[PDB]
Design a protein around this ligand. Sequence first.
Ligand SMILES: *CCC(=O)Nc1cccc(F)c1Nc1ncc(OCc2c(Cl)c(OC)cc(OC)c2Cl)cn1
Length: 270
Amino acid sequence: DLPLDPLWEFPRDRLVLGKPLGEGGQVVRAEAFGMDPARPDQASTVAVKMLKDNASDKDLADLVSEMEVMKLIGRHKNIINLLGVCTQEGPLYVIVECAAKGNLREFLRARRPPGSSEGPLSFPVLVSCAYQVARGMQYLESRKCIHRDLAARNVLVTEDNVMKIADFGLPVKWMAPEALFDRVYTHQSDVWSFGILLWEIFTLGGSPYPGIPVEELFSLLREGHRMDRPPHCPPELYGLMRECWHAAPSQRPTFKQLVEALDKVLLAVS
Ligand SMILES: *CCC(=O)Nc1cccc(F)c1Nc1ncc(OCc2c(Cl)c(OC)cc(OC)c2Cl)cn1
């Protein structure tokens, strides 16, 4: 039973629902008509979150929360953006961008060359992915958003291969020490996760701490151990991973610094 926000209300009759992308609440693919009000006939493919009939007063407040948080954070090329909402005379729909090529883990895994051969993702394309994620996090950070669960599974990829951070408005191998032990999340804890994300990228969607069982990880970290440089990963990049994986959060680089460092590498191609 909700207010009508004229900046975001989109007509429910202009949103043709399609194939479900996820159940668990649910998320549905949809063709929206005139998300660009420049060309109001033009169709675009979008995603839509909504509640299932099996859902409490609480679940509604969460979806309202995420919606409202997304309005407040605002727009950036490197996050999944809010596009509109449907709040009146019918169920809550939160409408957002739909990334054509799915999440970043699966994008990279489906692009692994066989064995020692060379694959379609060049080094610059991979550093580019990492830079784009860094820019998105820098932006979310500048809007006081702590992600808490940054990982390749939570970055999505557009048709034009643009990284878009997902689920920012609401996993032990991705978590910083202070988050694991002390249940403390900060921007710096997101930085730790970005390091892990970096290793994911340069392993084409590798499973972090390969071998090591989850219960034996917390002690490997305490001893000062970290993942090894992956094969073919240059040391400038490996070094960033490692700076992200410092135990003291203040000793980790900021997202600003991550963006600059990654920028240097991309400038240093040609
Ligand atoms: C658009 C074409 C398509 O089918 N894409 C697709 C296939 C398989 C996996 C996959 F991730 C995608 N792309 C995609 N899925 C979901 C979303 O948006 C989910 C989402 C929703 Cl519904 C929010 O609603 C509040 C919020 C956020 O985070 C901000 C996300 Cl990621 C986008 N793209």
